[PDB]
Please model this.
Amino acid sequence: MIPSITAYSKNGLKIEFTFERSNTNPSVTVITIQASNSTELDMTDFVFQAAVPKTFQLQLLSPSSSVVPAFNTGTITQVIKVLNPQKQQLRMRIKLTYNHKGSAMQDLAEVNNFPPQSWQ
Ligand SMILES: [Xe]
Ligand SMILES: [Xe]
Model:
């Protein structure tokens, strides 16, 4: 009912967002993030961070793990709750940090493709 989106897809790392409206607080959208890794090597010590504009509040819940396993063999799932008291267009800056092939990777990206249903 809220379309899912690919929030990020780069360097073998894909982050999908699925959305649900909170049953508790109709101003809250619950985003379930799924990180997957299409590469041959695990992405370890993986950390998702996000920031949203001033009018919103965010709660990031604990991720399912810290490894995005190679070959799409599973995902990291993590829930972000977004409170949007002013029904503003949701947009988000995400920061992804992980190790891959022994190297520290980090990328900052904007997610500006939130479906209207996620914030209207
Ligand atoms: Xe994640
Ligand atoms: Xe960020």
Remarks:
- Strands lie at 5-10, 13-21, 28-37, 44-51, 57-60, 76-83, 92-100, 103-111.
- The two ends are 12 Å apart (CA to CA).
- The longest strand covers residues 28-37.
- Residues 49, 51, 93-95, 108 surround xenon (ligand 2) (CB under 6 Å).
